Amino acid sequence: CSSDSRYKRQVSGDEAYLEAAPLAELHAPAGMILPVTSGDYAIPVTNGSGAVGKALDIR
């Protein structure tokens, strides 16, 4: 049929974004704090959790 690295092929999927890269907020002193959240940077940690990542099925 096919061949790739002595397998057939390799398809797309991720758990790396599920690994959710570490974020360390500012402890910045008063009068030395920027408006440090702008844009669509708005992540409500919401949970209908279900399967997640590659285990998350998609229909």
């Binding site: 910045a28 009068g31 030395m32 704090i33 920027l34």
Partner: protein, 87 residues
Amino acid sequence: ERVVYRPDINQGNYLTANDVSKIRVGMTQQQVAYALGTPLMSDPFGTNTWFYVFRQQPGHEGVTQQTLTLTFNSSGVLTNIDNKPAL
């Protein structure tokens, strides 16, 4: 630095001596912004200090720089026109 030519490095954004004399301690930011618009650098978390800092280095003959700040107060009324030379 035993080289003579360098590909010339600049950094503009500077209120010239006209732009210094155009404005005065007491002006609003707007009073400067009608002529001189925004700065490309202000205070991020303090007062309204409008920074306009020139830099340039031509030819291993040193670097030049003209560091201009415009400290408007919390109300934006100008309180300091500090233009600093190189170094």
